[PDB]
Design a protein around this nucleic acid. Structure first.
Lengths: 96, 84, 111, 99, 270, 118, 109, 95, 85
DNA sequence: ATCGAGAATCCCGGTGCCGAGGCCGCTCAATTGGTCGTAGACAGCTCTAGCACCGCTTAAACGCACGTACGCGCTGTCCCCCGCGTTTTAACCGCCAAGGGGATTACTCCCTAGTCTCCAGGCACGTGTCAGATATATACATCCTGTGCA
DNA sequence: TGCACAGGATGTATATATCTGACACGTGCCTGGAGACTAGGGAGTAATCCCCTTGGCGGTTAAAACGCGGGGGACAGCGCGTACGTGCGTTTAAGCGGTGCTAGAGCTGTCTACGACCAATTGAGCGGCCTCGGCACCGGGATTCTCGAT
């Protein structure tokens, strides 16, 4: 039939059940969350690509993403996101 | 075979007063209805120009909601809840 | 033959798909090469933001005596917090309404 | 005796409180759709509109007008008044950037 | 249109009209560079009402169908036959341009109701309908001068040429009139009180470099002194015996027309 | 081999077409680019440059000057409505601002109204 | 007329009435181009603000020049909006509330 | 040692084409050079977004035309479209 | 580099603020404006420098260049012609 | 400054019901393993600006006196907007066709990416020159004040 | 007390003359764009397929429109006090020119390790399908502001 559609529904649902074990979510709220995730993704990716282009560099590493998230997110959000990202990268490198 | 002329008056005075009441306005002068209609028409035509340009670039004849979403994102007005 | 094939998301200990993020990074015309830790970092920060917004929205839903989130609750959560309101500064959420706010000068006097 | 009548200003406050806690659209659907079609006829004849397209247009226009009216109310209060007049809308749009 | 009219009139006795119109036609001959000055009184024959006039008291509907006077038809023919170097008019009726008088010989110090000017390139447009705006403000039309290389047009805000008190004066015109008076041999003002300056001081500067001065006005002027001939009769009839002792007669006023440059030398006897 | 004429000359332009092509292919905009895109983009850039720089030249000549300085560029951009809309929020160094004083701030009233002097 | 042609016909240097030197200065500074703030104090302010993010930095001269140009342009635009707000309230003096309103409408507070 | 390309000679050629007797200072030259490669990247980014929006990987003339008609307002957009069409037709006709 | 801090906000003197207001087109200035605009200016500056430093330390540098400032200003939605390019 | 009618709002408990949430089959995208060639990490130099300090000149910031123009508070009026009835007006809801057009495959061909050579357009650099700033030197249109007459 | 001039005083305009540093221009390199040539896959047609847009009809009321009486607030005057603009004498530190030192900004080599790419493998995730309860409405009373007496 019709082609497949990519969405962030299952992962947003997993996070919601991680933080609130009992509350649910409607379809329109799920679509709004999907749009929010896509918007933040494209903002961070564009900022990282511009950062890489400014330094005559061909790769987007974790340093570019960290600088992009400290340029975009404000204050406490920036610090907590940086902490979470570094924790995830350390866990990924040590476990593999 | 169909021409529509006097549709800017479809946004009636009670609708404008309702929109102003949601904004927090307590008492409303009698001349702001024409000003509101003019500014609404300007905003609508500004958005619709880009929307129709986006549709006609794709060789389509139907204005999809995603074209409206892109046209709004272009003017620094992001809209969540309609995909994209 | 081969191993048990864990996913990279499980290896990093996070819920978002790092593989899908890496695919959208390679096939989205951002750079000419993509590192091996950029998808993990970006998935971790995306999950953090999603968890923060969802926690605030659930708190608002409980404050409203409901057990299912609607766009009104998301709007309340993102407008009552000074960080997300500035990250999502000029963004309109459909069917979200506005914060209940009336100027003090408009309130009736002599009382 | 005289019939019950509310003093001018309290029904407006009740309207404000009721419309600030509700989320439905405020303008009627068909007039807005006809206005959108009439405006669009001046760019390309024989067009078609999805329902979601006009829904999104209405959702954006309502928020735009609500924000503009909040700025207009601030401008009116700045000038020791409580009524909004066209000059307040003009000043708000001067400052915002539309001019 | 009220109170009273504190105006003395002498009309000067009829026998001395012929005397000093004959004597004026004398000075007309040996003058090689004559610069005329014109005032509101030239248009009184056409019934053109509205400063003294404003203090004593918008006729655009009368302006759109106004008819140039007899003397207006005189000066255009004097231009077309020679012995006329320049013309300075401080009127806003615009009858001189509509009379077929070339614009390059005309200095409109106070402007014209029938002319618009661009605010970005300072070009001038001569319309046929009345421009309905006073005070160097917007008109509603736009400039249409086209640039080259396929670029856009001027598209500047067209404005009127009617001035207001304390506002600046046209440079192109003031300078031209000044050079003209400095290079004047004779000057004959017609129907003005010689009161509003800087225009009023143009005639006197004529004698400054060794020149003469002839004033024609029913009312007295603040520059009646330092003259050469003072005319006190009606400009409508005095010009008749002006032209009778010189020759020719008015060709026609064949409707509103505009003339940019002047015809190659002089038709008819000089 | 051949005469080797530049693409800008073949298109009747002044801005480089090959440089624009190289910038388009090395700017990470798309996987591949067409053959006519550089010509179109160079023509658009040249037209915009000519518009701005003719208005600046007119403004410079208006001030008895034979050079274009940033002040003239700012004046040309600001006095034009469409260019000011395009450069709506752009700061030009050493540009200054347009001469503009509000009508309320003017003193006025110091002029005879011509009312027969009472 | 080689001076004030125009249209018409007609104690201690009077101290000038309060508000003519104001317009003279307005015209003088509106037809000028140069910067309006002293350069060393601005550089010291920039260094003070910068050394609260990373210690012991260095600045190119072009960096502080660009910062000064941007700051002056921002302040001039903000003051123009403040003047519009003050005139809207039937005044000629600019109050801090005018600046607050101008910054609130723009979306900066 | 290293070469730093800029749009100096090209805009000076345009200046002498539109005003044959007017010069330009170095600061104005730099400002124009910044304007050129600001508009360049603005149009190119709009075209890249427009191409990604239709699942295509080629920036043809149509994407550039639509981008310049989306960015430039009114008469500027119409005249730029006319100039670009003229240039493209001449380039194709001359082979 | 040895000296750390003093009251440098006062370097933006009153006459400089009045000159900026005059270029803006202001006829009369209140007495409380001077302490306001200073407080505004700082909030502007630390919103740009904080970005520029963020660029400078990304390239492993120890010198804030003009391009860092231009990029930071462009990121704020406020470009600046005359220093980069 | 206090009571009491009265319209409006908030619990209370039924009740359908349509949408949120769980299950299952299966294409398809993520994963694992190996090869490789280049992007970038790491040293090492060169020298270019960035920083520190000193004198001198003077433009500007500063402190103070003073007067007037402007901001703020009252006061009156009259006019424009709000609140409540009553009547039209048209929006909204169900239901039904009839296509027009957006999606989906198949196929082919022409358009664009690699690569390879080479030579001329464009950049770095040195130079004479000319436009923009300042500084007198005549020329001229107004404007102000002193010395005789009805 | 009001004219009538004459001549000195005031501000503006045009014309030369000198200076100086940025600019227009000529020259020598050099590397990047142009001309040939080939391969492969992106996209332009062509043909179905179904779905979702548009137009129509009809009953029901929700809401808009119109009318009318008050009332309160927007606007125009007055009046007063003070604070802000203006001018002048002090001072003070900015701006310039100069000298000196060195931190690190650019640039060049060398090597290695790390993403791109290509085949097999397989399980997380999507579309389709059921199924039950969170929730939006139904009134009925119970409070709760609100405004007029008193």
């Amino acid at each position: 039939k019709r082609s497949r559609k990519e969405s962030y529904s299952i992962y947003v649902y997993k996070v919601l059940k991680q933080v609130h074990p009992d509350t649910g979510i409607s379809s329109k709220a799920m679509g709004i969350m999907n749009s929010f995730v896509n918007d933040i993704f494209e903002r961070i990716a564009g900022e990282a690509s511009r950062l890489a282009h400014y330094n005559k560099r061909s790769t987007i590493t974790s340093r570019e993403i960290q600088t992009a998230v400290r340029l975009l997110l404000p204050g406490e959000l920036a610090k907590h996101a940086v902490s979470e990202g570094t924790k995830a990268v350390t866990k990924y490198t040590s476990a593999k | 075979r169909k021409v529509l002329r006097d549709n800017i008056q479809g946004i009636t005075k009670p609708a404008i007063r309702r929109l102003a009441r949601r904004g927090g306005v307590k008492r409303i002068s009698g001349l702001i209805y024409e000003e509101t209609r003019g500014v609404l028409k300007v905003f609508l035509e500004n958005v619709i120009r880009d929307a129709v340009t986006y549709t006609e670039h794709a060789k389509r004849k139907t204005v999809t909601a995603m074209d409206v979403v892109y046209a709004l994102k272009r003017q620094g007005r992001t809209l969540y809840g309609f995909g994209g | 033959a081969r191993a048990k094939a864990k996913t990279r998301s499980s290896r990093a200990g996070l819920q978002f798909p790092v593989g899908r993020v890496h695919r959208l990074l390679r096939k989205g015309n951002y750079s000419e090469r993509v590192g091996a830790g950029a998808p993990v970092y970006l998935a971790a920060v995306l999950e953090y933001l999603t968890a923060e917004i969802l926690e605030l929205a659930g708190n608002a839903a409980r404050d409203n005596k409901k057990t299912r989130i609607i766009p009104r609750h998301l709007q309340l959560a993102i407008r009552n917090d000074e960080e997300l309101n500035k990250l999502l500064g000029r963004v309109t959420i459909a069917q979200g309404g506005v914060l209940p706010n009336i100027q003090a000068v408009l309130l009736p006097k002599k009382t | 005796k005289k019939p019950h009548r509310y003093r001018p200003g309290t029904v407006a406050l009740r309207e404000i409180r009721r419309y600030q806690k509700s989320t439905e659209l405020l303008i009627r659907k068909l007039p807005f759709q006809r206005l959108v079609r009439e405006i669009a006829q001046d760019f390309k004849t024989d067009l078609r509109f999805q329902s979601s397209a006009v829904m999104a247009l209405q959702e954006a226009s309502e928020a735009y007008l609500v924000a503009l009216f909040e700025d207009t109310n601030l401008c009116a209060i700045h000038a020791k008044r409580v009524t909004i007049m066209p000059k307040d809308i003009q000043l708000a749009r001067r400052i915002r950037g539309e001019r | 249109d009220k109170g009273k009219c504190g105006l003395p009139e002498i009309f000067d006795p009829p026998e001395e009209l012929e005397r000093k119109v004959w004597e004026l036609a004398r000075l007309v001959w040996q003058s090689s560079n004559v610069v005329f000055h014109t005032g509101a009184g030239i248009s009184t024959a056409s019934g053109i009402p509205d400063v003294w006039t404003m203090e004593e008291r918008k006729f655009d509907t009368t302006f759109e169908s106004a008819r140039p006077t007899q003397t207006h038809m005189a000066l255009v023919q004097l231009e077309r036959v020679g012995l006329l170097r320049f013309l300075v008019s401080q009127n806003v009726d615009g009858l001189h341009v509509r009379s077929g008088f070339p614009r390059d010989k005309l200095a409109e110090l106070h402007g014209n109701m029938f002319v618009e000017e661009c605010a970005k390139c300072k070009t001038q447009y001569v319309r046929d309908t009345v421009v309905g705006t006073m005070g160097l403000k917007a008109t509603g039309r736009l400039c249409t001068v086209a640039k080259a290389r396929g670029l856009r047009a001027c598209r500047g805000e067209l404005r009127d040429t009617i001035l207001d008190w304390e506002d600046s004066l046209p440079d192109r015109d003031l300078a031209l009139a000044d050079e003209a008076s400095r290079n004047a041999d004779l000057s004959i003002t017609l129907g003005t009180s010689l009161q509003i300056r800087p225009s009023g001081n143009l005639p006197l500067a004529t004698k400054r470099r060794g020149g003469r001065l002839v004033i024609v006005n029913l009312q007295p002027t603040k520059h009646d002194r330092h003259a050469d001939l003072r005319i006190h009769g009606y400009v409508d009839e005095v010009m008749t015996r002006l032209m009778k002792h010189l020759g020719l007669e008015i060709p026609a006023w064949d409707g509103p027309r505009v003339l940019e440059r002047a015809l190659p030398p002089l038709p008819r006897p000089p």
